[PDB]
Amino acid sequence: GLGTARLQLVEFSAFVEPQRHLFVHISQLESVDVRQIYDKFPEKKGGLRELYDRGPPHAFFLVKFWADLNWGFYGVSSQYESLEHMTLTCSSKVCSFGKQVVEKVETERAQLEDGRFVYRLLRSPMCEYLVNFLHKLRQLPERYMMNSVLENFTILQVVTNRDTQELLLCTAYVFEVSTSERGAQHHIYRLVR
């Protein structure tokens, strides 16, 4: 799924606890042309266009999320695994109208477990930008209006081998809102060119 030979995403979620509520969730394949989502991130040029150019291309993914905004502590939990012992640097950049408004950098050392290495980045506090954005968003009286606002909101996650600075995974995230009857959903795509 979302991964390479060196590093795979095992689980991703963002949630609020007052039993808890997942806005989005991935627990653990088509293609999309990165071309069409440059405007959605900064031309840093450390932004998407620049990163996809250094490579490698098989490390790049796009995820479309249909978030459940129908519901505290706001948290993000991430888990990766690999067969090699590594220390990871995880960069998350929140962008609004192609401009970066948050960058969060975290480090996680491998933990030996059941014949492989796991990397657990759990219950990291969600940035306040997002908490405040979510409280506004859930106020909109129509889902079509939430989707219009979310057209301009994206996240770019870059996971690097800290000791070698090699890119392991780069994931672009885009968002719409789901209904309550249908839960959160996602679709994972390969980014190509």
Ligand X SMILES: CCCCCCCCCCCCCCCC(=O)O
CB of residue 159 to ligand X, shortest distance in Å: 12
User: Which range, of 35-43, 47-55, 120-128, 161-169, touches ligand X by CB under 6 A?
Assistant: 120-128
Q: Which of positions 18-47 make contact with ligand X (CB under 6 A)?
A: 23-24
H or E segment and range at residue 149: helix 143-150
**Can you tell me which of 10, 48, 62, 76 binds ligand X, judged by CB under 6 A?**
76
126 Cβ partners below 8 Å, 6+ apart? 14, 74, 75, 76
DSSP E strand stretches across the chain:
8-17, 21-27, 31-33, 60-67, 73-82, 87-96, 99-109, 111-113, 116-125, 153-161, 167-177, 185-192
Q: Do 59 and 168 touch, CB atoms closer than 8 A?
A: yes
CB of residue 157 to ligand X, shortest distance in Å: 7
Nearer CB in complex with ligand X: 152/164:
152
CB of residue 119 to ligand X, shortest distance in Å: 15
90 binds ligand X (CB under 6 A): no
Residue 174: closest CA among 154, 192, 157, 144: 154
CB of residue 137 to ligand X, shortest distance in Å: 6
67 binds ligand X (CB under 6 A): yes
94 binds ligand X (CB under 6 A): yes
- Exposure string for 168-179, b = 16+ CB within 10 A, e = fewer: bbbbbbebbbbe
Nearer CB in complex with ligand X: 92/160:
92
95 binds ligand X (CB under 6 A): no
Report residue 182 as tokens.
Answer: 């249908």
Q: Which residue has the tokens 């989005």?
A: 24
Q: Which of positions 137-176 make contact with ligand X (CB under 6 A)?
A: 150, 155, 175
Report residue 64 as tokens.
Answer: 């479309």
**Can you tell me which of 8, 79, 82, 92 binds ligand X, judged by CB under 6 A?**
92
Nearer CB in complex with ligand X: 51/150:
150
Q: Which residue has the tokens 């600075």?
A: 165
For ligand X, the binding residues (CB under 6 A) are: 14, 23-24, 67, 76, 92, 94, 102, 104, 124, 126-127, 130, 134, 150, 155, 175
